[PDB]
Amino acid sequence: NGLPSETYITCAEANEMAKTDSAQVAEIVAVMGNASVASRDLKIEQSPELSAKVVEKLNQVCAKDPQMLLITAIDDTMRAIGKK
Amino acid sequence: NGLPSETYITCAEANEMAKTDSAQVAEIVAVMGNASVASRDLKIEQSPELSAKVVEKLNQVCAKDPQMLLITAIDDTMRAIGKK
């Protein structure tokens, strides 16, 4: 919880900023996401489309429960795609 | 040299595309960039300040060498960071 404001931000609210700054929102989500999911296989193809997905479905989950911080929310995707 | 167009595109020309799509470009460079550099230490965090950085100076290096493919270009950046 003692993380920088950007990292401690909620994924749902990340969409709010996305209209102004899609870059910093989609980047961190993708950059962390891919690196953190590579932890279980290490061959997660680096392609804009996959990232585009991680902020689409993830924010959808956030819409269901706002108690998910951006940092933890994407971690649930790590386990979702992390089914090896 | 037989890789898909986008990943076979030079860092210099990738910046050109960023003018139309800053996302796909800043993403892929930070995505694999951070993933590859973290493969040497894993002490490297993910921040929006890094994408801008890895696509800034690199495009300048590739401005001196248009032959530098995106993949190779980022490798050279890893070398710089891996220099400890």
Cα(B3)–Cα(A76) distance, integer angstroms:
32
Contact B3, B50 (CB under 8 A): no
Measured between beta carbons, which residues in chain A are less than 8 angstroms from residue B50? 31
Nearest 5°: CA angle at A11, between A8 and A12? 125
Residue of A nearest to B23 (CA): A23
User: Any CB–CB contact under 8 A between B31 and chain A?
Assistant: yes
**Selection from B61, B29, B75, B4 nearest residue A34 by Cα:** B29
Contact B80, B42 (CB under 8 A): no
Cα(B68)–Cα(B70) distance, integer angstroms:
6
Contact B36, B77 (CB under 8 A): no
Contact A69, A8 (CB under 8 A): yes
Q: How was this structure determined?
A: NMR
Q: Which helix (H) or strand (E) holds A14?
A: helix A11-18
Cα(B66)–Cα(B30) distance, integer angstroms:
20
Select from 3.40.50.620, 3.40.140.10, 1.10.3720.10, 1.10.890.30 the CATH code of B1-84. Answer: 1.10.890.30
- Give the residue extent of every domain in chain A: 1-84
- B10: β partners: B69
Nearest 5°: CA angle at B77, between A21 and B3? 85
Contact A75, A15 (CB under 8 A): no
- CA of residue B24 relative to chain centroid, distance: 12
Q: Any long-range contacts for A50-55 (C-beta under 8 Å, 24+ apart)?
A: A51/A26, A51/B27, A51/B31, A52/A26, A54/A29, A54/A30, A55/A14, A55/A18, A55/A25, A55/A26, A55/A29, A55/A30
Exposure on the CB side of residue B10, measured as CA atoms within 13 A: 12
Measured between beta carbons, which residues in chain B are less than 8 angstroms from residue A26? 23, 27
Cα(A68)–Cα(A84) distance, integer angstroms:
24
**Token pair for B37:** 């550099």
CB contact under 8 Å between A28 and B47, yes or no, is: yes
Q: Residue B53's CB: how many other CB atoms inside 10 A? A: 15
